[PDB]
Amino acid sequence: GEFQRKLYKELVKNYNPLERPVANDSQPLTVYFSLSLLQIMDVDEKNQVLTTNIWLQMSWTDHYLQWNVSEYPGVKTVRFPDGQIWKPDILLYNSADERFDATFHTNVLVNSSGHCQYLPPGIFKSSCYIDVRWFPFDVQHCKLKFGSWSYGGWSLDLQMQEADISGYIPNGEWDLVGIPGKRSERFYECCKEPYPDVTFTVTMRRRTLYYGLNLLIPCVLISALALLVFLLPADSGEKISLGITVLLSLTVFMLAVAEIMPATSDSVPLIAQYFASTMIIVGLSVVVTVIVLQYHHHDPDGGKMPKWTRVILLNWCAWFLRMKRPGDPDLAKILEEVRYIANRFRCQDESEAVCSEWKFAACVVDRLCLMAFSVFTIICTIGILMSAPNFVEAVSKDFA
Amino acid sequence: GEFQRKLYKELVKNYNPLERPVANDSQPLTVYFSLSLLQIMDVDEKNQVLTTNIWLQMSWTDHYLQWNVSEYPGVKTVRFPDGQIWKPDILLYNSADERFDATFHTNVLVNSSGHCQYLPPGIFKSSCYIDVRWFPFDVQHCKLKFGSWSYGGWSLDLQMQEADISGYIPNGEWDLVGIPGKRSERFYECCKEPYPDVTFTVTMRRRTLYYGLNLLIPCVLISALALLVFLLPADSGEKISLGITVLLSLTVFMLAVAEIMPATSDSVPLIAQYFASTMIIVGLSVVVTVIVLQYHHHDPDGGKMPKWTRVILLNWCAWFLRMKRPGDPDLAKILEEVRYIANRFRCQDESEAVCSEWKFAACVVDRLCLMAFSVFTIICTIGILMSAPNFVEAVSKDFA
Amino acid sequence: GEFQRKLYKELVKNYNPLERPVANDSQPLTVYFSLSLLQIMDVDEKNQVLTTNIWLQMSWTDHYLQWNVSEYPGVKTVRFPDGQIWKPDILLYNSADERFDATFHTNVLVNSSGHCQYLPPGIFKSSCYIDVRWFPFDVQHCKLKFGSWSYGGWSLDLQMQEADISGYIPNGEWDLVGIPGKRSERFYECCKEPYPDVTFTVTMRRRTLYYGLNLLIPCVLISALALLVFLLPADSGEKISLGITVLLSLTVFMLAVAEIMPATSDSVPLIAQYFASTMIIVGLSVVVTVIVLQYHHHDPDGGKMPKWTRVILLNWCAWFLRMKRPGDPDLAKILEEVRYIANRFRCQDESEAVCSEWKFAACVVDRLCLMAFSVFTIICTIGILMSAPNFVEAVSKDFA
Amino acid sequence: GEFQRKLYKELVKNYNPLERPVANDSQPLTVYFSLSLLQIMDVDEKNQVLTTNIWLQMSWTDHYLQWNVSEYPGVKTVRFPDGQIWKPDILLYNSADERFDATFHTNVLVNSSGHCQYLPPGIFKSSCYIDVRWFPFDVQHCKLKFGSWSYGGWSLDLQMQEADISGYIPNGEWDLVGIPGKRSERFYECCKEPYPDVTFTVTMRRRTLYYGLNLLIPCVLISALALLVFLLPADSGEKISLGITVLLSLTVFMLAVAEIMPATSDSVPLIAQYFASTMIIVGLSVVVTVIVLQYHHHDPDGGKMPKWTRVILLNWCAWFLRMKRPGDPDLAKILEEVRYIANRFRCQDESEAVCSEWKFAACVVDRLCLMAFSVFTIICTIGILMSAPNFVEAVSKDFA
Amino acid sequence: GEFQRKLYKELVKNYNPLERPVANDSQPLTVYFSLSLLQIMDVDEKNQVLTTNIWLQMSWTDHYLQWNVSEYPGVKTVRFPDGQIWKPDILLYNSADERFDATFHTNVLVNSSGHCQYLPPGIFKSSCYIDVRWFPFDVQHCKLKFGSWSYGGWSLDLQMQEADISGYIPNGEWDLVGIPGKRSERFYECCKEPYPDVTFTVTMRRRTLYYGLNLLIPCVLISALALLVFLLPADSGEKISLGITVLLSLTVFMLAVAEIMPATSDSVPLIAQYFASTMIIVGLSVVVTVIVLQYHHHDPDGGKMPKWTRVILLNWCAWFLRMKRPGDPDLAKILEEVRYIANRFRCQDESEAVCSEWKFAACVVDRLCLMAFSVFTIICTIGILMSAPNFVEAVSKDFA
Numbered sequence A, B, C, D, E: 001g002e003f004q005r006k007l008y009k010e011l012v013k014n015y016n017p018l019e020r021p022v023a024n025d026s027q028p029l030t031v032y033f034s035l036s037l038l039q040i041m042d043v044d045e046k047n048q049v050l051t052t053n054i055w056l057q058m059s060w061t062d063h064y065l066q067w068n069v070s071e072y073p074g075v076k077t078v079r080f081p082d083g084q085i086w087k088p089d090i091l092l093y094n095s096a097d098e099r100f101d102a103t104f105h106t107n108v109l110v111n112s113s114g115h116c117q118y119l120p121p122g123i124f125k126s127s128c129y130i131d132v133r134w135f136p137f138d139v140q141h142c143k144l145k146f147g148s149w150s151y152g153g154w155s156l157d158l159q160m161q162e163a164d165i166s167g168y169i170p171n172g173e174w175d176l177v178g179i180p181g182k183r184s185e186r187f188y189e190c191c192k193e194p195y196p197d198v199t200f201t202v203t204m205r206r207r208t209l210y211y212g213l214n215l216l217i218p219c220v221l222i223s224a225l226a227l228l229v230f231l232l233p234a235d236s237g238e239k240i241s242l243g244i245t246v247l248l249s250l251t252v253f254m255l256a257v258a259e260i261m262p263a264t265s266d267s268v269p270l271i272a273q274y275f276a277s278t279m280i281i282v283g284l285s286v287v288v289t290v291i292v293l294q295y296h297h298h299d300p301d302g303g304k305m306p307k308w309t310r311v312i313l314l315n316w317c318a319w320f321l322r323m324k325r326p327g328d329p330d331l332a333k334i335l336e337e338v339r340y341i342a343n344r345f346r347c348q349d350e351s352e353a354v355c356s357e358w359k360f361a362a363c364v365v366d367r368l369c370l371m372a373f374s375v376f377t378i379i380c381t382i383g384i385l386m387s388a389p390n391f392v393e394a395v396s397k398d399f400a
């Protein structure tokens, strides 16, 4: 329209985009900075980066971009692109994006009274410290730090407004707790001018249903299946195969899991302690199986059992476990021949009885160690999962 | 030509690219926005992003870009590049691209009567929520939201035109159901001006031939092969090897499959429930194999078989399964010695008969558990695959 | 020089880069579009993208960029950068590149008679449909679609010149069959003006030496090694171990291979059918092994063999395979005692003979199934590899 | 304000951004270059690149950007964007980034006396040589080299200021030792003008907790578990299964670990020597197990054991290990028949005794080799981890 | 300075950046092109791309950028940025970078006599053909082709200068042999003007320490460990387990290695032939193990050992290997019963002797095949490693 064309022609006249738009130079310019979180697109524990889709919200009063609506009846707002009117250079301080500024420079709306608006979208990559000590039951506080890059306190009086999450779309992995902000004033070694900033802390809680179903449950099942070695009879040579192939499967699983975790050394992750406990339990099960097979394939001629181990393993554990404890010259010379055969058979029977007693001792050791291992693994897993704080509320919110 | 050069020289004179091209400022400018889907290049279930190749279509009437063809005999249309004539700043709201605007700014055609056209191509990355609950038999509704960024209802009267899929090239993985649109008016906390938008919902159905052939069928085959442990005779100490190696192979398969799935916690994926069922079946088969081997290698001196289990496992299951149930002083002193040898042989035969009865009990348990496991596996797989809606039509469209 | 400086000063005078350089506006401008393929740097079967290094070739006549060499003795050509003289906006329609235009805008040569040249290089990512039905013996026809984006038939009369492959450097994976093209005229729903285009079809044949050596040969070898179970005597407890560890190795191999193939559902890949055949063969090998072990470890007291299976497996298969078929009162009291011992030995010998006959039946079953499985594997692999068209010429060109 | 607008209008007048801002052309311009490290975001051992988030700090005196505050009462500092005032072209020489300059060009503050400030942020990818010889106990010295690209010693007198690490945020993997620098003057083959530069050496020590917990400890555990083959009795045919499955698990572990190390050939990494030692230990354990099984399954009819090995293995090793060393015509016809049976039994017993002696020799060899292997593996691991310098202080700082 | 400002103001006056800076238009402009290699940052065998960090060096005489130092006492050189003075459009022809030009356009120094310098840095991605036939002992000749894109021979007389490698930093993987260049003149189909170019061949030799320590040595070790199956006594059912687990480990290793090689079909890589030999050796070892177990578990009643195999395997191989070759009515009725028992024992002894002879034949076959396999493996590995040229000098340079 003619009025809009005239207004645009007269508005840009004698206008310097570099100049700070204030009537009095000494007075600082008030800028209201806010944020509009839309989606936590991705968080990278390994890379310690947080990818978010947010809309920055900036607003300030421009002294030069004013006009009377009476002379321009139809024109109420005007929009200027990048590089034609003054804009605050508000950057994300802790940015992990290859280009330090990830905003998409859009137009700037202008009141009929000089008030300006600026909502540049963009996907921000911020380097936030991520705790995996309580993985997967961890809550994260990733900070977004915004502030003017080259204007100080006396120039650009930055002000905070509450972050808006009305348009936030829920993420399938992270539950948002809140996004509070805090306005802080910080000095710098360059200059004697404070540089105010606005810091937004994105507190988000990880939803642990997928991790509990795909990481914790399979390890519980495989560890419990490793205890089956203590039910296999030793006569079938499959105990070591069972134990060691279970160990190999656990090795593959733990390798795949560790493929996705940060190489941080601040503390031992909860899942790392859990996997260490499972590995130790399986290894000690294999060691006990080796001991049991030593006690089972014990040659009777090797030597008599020690009295102490004999009495304890055949009395105390049996009482505890309620196990059942098993149990003319030609004529004379033929007689002595049959005597040799019969005595050989009797000696064979005695050796067989000794070996059977050794086998029973192996079985008793096996059963007692099965009970001990089952109790220990249950107690250890329960304790490890109890140790994580907010674990009960994570369970209540996800599973229940 | 001379006429075209004169027209270009005169048309740009006193033209402001910022001004909205309307004759009456109060009246809003009508913009007809459409879309031309060409190809669904990629969808990322893990990243919850949808990559599409589309041509945006905008059209509006420009009051200033008008001329009489009589004075320019050969010139019917003119073309302006980016930044020289007014263009709507129609952006994809839910964009997951590193740069928020993925369009390639092309030329802009103009009528001889002022009507304008604008078809900027580009590959758009939009963050759409992806449901894996019914994976791989899921239908996806990924939304594309377009609307002016700085112009409200009273400024840019955005309108919807039906999406064009004439040039759409079929994708090898996803079957397009449709791309309907909906024009909605939404308020914002910034301003008291409604901002109309156009939302296109891309309804896509996944073609399940590849997934059924490469994920489901191998699991059915391996789970069925795990049941072979219940046909191996216990004498060959290989049952545990069979079952455990099958479990390890399934572990590798499920790990590789889960490598491609999003870490969402809204619901348990169908294939996740299926894998859980297969893992449980294999583990229970291994447990039953351990019990069977306990029954097989039962020492006759350990104790008499309990009356209840004896009667049930030797009468009821045998009747059910129709199994066959098997079955001077020198002379006298030599006599008593040969009596000893024969009595030893008779006791050995009695112990052998008891052990054989134990072995038959183990075989009966093994056979009945084979039948139970086969029936349970078939029923569970059929039910899980039935639970997915549109499974029947997916099968009919893909396989048949 | 002075002449060149004067020519450049006078040439740009009253020159509009937007204007189409024609003397008569009504007549269209003839543009000769060609292409110079140099290297097929990459083709992504999984992503359905083709990455090529090509030089576009454009040529047209400028009415305004003309001068007389007499007044400029030294100057024969002039060069203009991007954005200073008119250039056709010829884009790759089916572009899968993040930026829709991948050309590198270079200088533009000009005749002394107005003729123009333009050879912008660039690496083009085009989305071409890729058939893996005959993989790895497949030939691919990936299309490149070029045409003016905003000029119609009456404005830019696009013409075609044959593609140049003189400078093409051979690829180590793909053998170029040819790059023919076709110039087509297509209408659009926007406008009543046809838009001519030039489509180049890149027909390339995959060289199958690497794939045959690294995928097909190892699977033949592993499948053949799986048949060794039918030579292992059943006395050594290793048959299921062999079969199932071969199955696990094939599982790893097929997983690694399937990691590289697209998730298309148009048809079952040839290598997919081949792997399915190998998996079925190994699975049935394990099943037959379980059957043979059932036959081998058959208790003699379990029951007499069925007459039909006895006669067939001990006569017909033996004849076929030419197998060798194996085979005072004290005196009376001692008499009856030794009679008992010898009768027990005779019964033991009878049971041993029955069990040995069962073992021979198992051996005969094993041998006949070995012959059947070897024949079936050879026939199936030969048929599957024969089914692929141009397989014989692929072999002749690669191996021979 | 009016004063700010007048100052900006008058300051840019007759200003040339290309000109070096010095009053006397002959005198060089002093530029103070510093650095502000904030975070070592990522280091890539495989790619030999270091990714850091740093703020360059440059400052110089501009002769033309001076004004009297008396005439501009409110204006104390002014800010210019990129391309409008002279800036030093200080580039990172050893840059491994796709674009050689990774800085984000921000504004430049200016004193009321001409002093200028410039703190452009950016994420810098520098190619630093990385030593993996002492991995994971290595300390890295990655260099950052900065200097003017086109200004020599007589033009831009580059000067140094100490690097600032007040704002440094600790990294979860690398402990910063310090960031000292050195200012060096270097000639070039192009020109006879020295080019001063500022080189900052980023000395960082790797925190070892995660690597020791996830790489070293599992290898210790698996190697120790491989020694259990020397406790399993040879009667249970599971020794080779144990050894070879442990070897396969170690193969998987070493493959996964070697996936993350560079293909560096200056020296053998410490973890590489460690894995080589573990592989040798496991392989030699398998070889010794094969020898032990040869000794155990020695047919008595094969031949008498050599006198030398007999005496040593049954006297010296027994003394060392304190092992218990185990241990009418009708009447005549029946007579000689029973004589035959008893003589057969006696010969059988003699052969059994010889085989038992062979088995005891195998057991003694097995035990002595167990002791030798345990001692050797402990000594080798201890020595390898001792060989790394600063290992003790790394352990003290991380674990303790 | 005032002199510098005046010089810059006067120099740009009547200066056209498009014009070629020559006094006489007819004579070509001489441009001296060189290169300064700094680091071979990365080479991609799979992608056939070479990533280098180089500084292009260009120099030419500008007729217009001349001044007398007498009138400008302090000004000796001036610097112009991109787009303000003429620069050769020298591009890397065989560029594989997404943007065809990877240079970073820096400033451009100028003499006081008109001579000009230009050293743009940048990381260049070039598509160079990579031979993996002799991998890992291969030497690579990757070409970099530079030349003016738009200027021909009569316009821009491109000239060569020797490449500079004084600042080259050694790479941890590739040993640089040299970077010779060659200036060639090549015609094009577009134009009748030759286009001179400068081609630099980067000859680099791969350092084989890491590859020989992580790829070759483990394969030698695993292949040698596969031969242990020929020392295991057949009585312990672990031969097939050993051989097949070794084969599975080799499968995993070869899959991981083949993950990193190009899918080229020009020729079979040396490491591929090596892996084929190892796989064949292991598979044939498994086949021979199956044959040995057939010979060992040969029932005596199947049939007499054939005369030919009997004589050869019990005489010739025994002589070769020097193996030890092992070895009233009541009375009469009781008599005949004991005769039956004794005859049964004698027949059992004869069958045992026949079985022992079969076992000895199996042992003889096993030992001879062990010797054959060891010799064949050593010979094949030595020959394959010898076949690669420059292998001896690669070993001398890396290991020694």
Ligand SMILES: CN1CCC[C@H]1c1cccnc1
Residues within 6 Å of the ligand: A148, A149, A150, A188, A190, A191, A195, D109, D117, D118, D119
């Ligand atoms: C607060 N600003 C942003 C970081 C440092 C500081 C600053 C100070 C002076 C010039 N540039 C930047």
Ligand SMILES: CN1CCC[C@H]1c1cccnc1
Residues within 6 Å of the ligand: A109, A117, A118, A119, B148, B149, B150, B188, B190, B191, B195
């Ligand atoms: C609808 N627009 C796009 C998102 C917010 C809104 C807006 C309003 C005012 C200034 N910028 C953006």
Ligand SMILES: CN1CCC[C@H]1c1cccnc1
Residues within 6 Å of the ligand: B109, B117, B118, B119, C148, C149, C150, C188, C190, C191, C195
């Ligand atoms: C052929 N052109 C390229 C694709 C669509 C078509 C077109 C028509 C009108 C305006 N822009 C584009």
Ligand SMILES: CN1CCC[C@H]1c1cccnc1
Residues within 6 Å of the ligand: C109, C117, C118, C119, E148, E149, E150, E188, E190, E191, E195
């Ligand atoms: C040598 N130049 C580079 C490749 C082709 C040739 C050329 C010729 C004319 C116009 N542009 C490029």
